Amino acid sequence: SIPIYDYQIVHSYPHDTKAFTEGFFYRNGYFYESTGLNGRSSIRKVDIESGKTLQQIELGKRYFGEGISDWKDKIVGLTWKNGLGFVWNIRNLRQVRSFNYDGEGWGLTHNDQYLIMSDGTPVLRFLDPESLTPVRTITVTAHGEELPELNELEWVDGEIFANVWQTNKIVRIDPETGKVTGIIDLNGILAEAGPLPSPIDVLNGIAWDKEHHRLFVTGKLWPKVFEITLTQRV
Numbered sequence: 748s749i750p751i752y753d754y755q756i757v758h759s760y761p762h763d764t765k766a767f768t769e770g771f772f773y774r775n776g777y778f779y780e781s782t783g784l785n786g787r788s789s790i791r792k793v794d795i796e797s798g799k800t801l802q803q804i805e806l807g808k809r810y811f812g813e814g815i816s817d818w819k820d821k822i823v824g825l826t827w828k829n830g831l832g833f834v835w836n837i838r839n840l841r842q843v844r845s846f847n848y849d850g851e852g853w854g855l856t857h858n859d860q861y862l863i864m865s866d867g868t869p870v871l872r873f874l875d876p877e878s879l880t881p882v883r884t885i886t887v888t889a890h891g892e893e894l895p896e897l898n899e900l901e902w903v904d905g906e907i908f909a910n911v912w913q914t915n916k917i918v919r920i921d922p923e924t925g926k927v928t929g930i931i932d933l934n935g936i937l938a939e940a941g942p943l944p945s946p947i948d949v950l951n952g953i954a955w956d957k958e959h960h961r962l963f964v965t966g967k968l969w970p971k972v973f974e975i976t977l978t979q980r981v
């Protein structure tokens with residue numbers, strides 16, 4: 748019953764083959780990426796066409812960054828094992844706040860009212876953007892069963908898209924119910940990426956350009972970001 752979507756590549760853009768993508772979004776014509784880079788973690792503003800960095804901060808050695816999302820004129824970021832997050836001004840990525848949260852923090856996105864965070868479990872949390880505390884909590888299910896390993900997130904036209912860690916699939920989640928209503932199958936997309944680096948890591952990172960309706964997907968150490976369209980299979 749859950750429709751499956753196949754992809755068509757519209758464009759491929761260069762992606763840093765050393766970049767362990769942990770957070771990824773599109774804003775004001777650019778990509779913003781939270782990356783692990785050889786043991787340390789950075790937040791970068793990236794030119795889409797060239798994949799080159801325009802602006803970057805490197806987090807303190809005590810912290811390792813995970814999901815990031817814009818909120819108004821801020822960027823909000825999660826961490827790997829710190830149980831805390833950060834808020835930066837978007838202009839110069841100056842840190843303005845730290846906040847605590849429960850458990851782990853993997854992917855982060857937002858809709859018009861809330862930040863939405865995953866943590867590698869089936870559970871998604873909707874944060875009040877001022878208090879940065881959970882005001883709604885939902886459990887994600889596919890075929891009526893809990894779906895764990897939810898990672899990078901993106902709000903796309905009223906749905907929550909999520910990477911499922913260790914797979915080449917992206918689930919489309921009904922935000923009212925937590926039910927998976929569609930599955931995007933990206934298996935085989937690496938065969939269309941050109942020469943691959945060694946090592947290479949997993950699919951992870953979804954961004955959405957609301958103005959032009961461009962959907963972008965990438966992965967850890969992946970040599971490309973793909974702009975893709977979707978068609979329902981069968």
Ligand SMILES: [Ca+2]
Nearest residue numbers: 771900901953
């Ligand atoms: Ca995202």
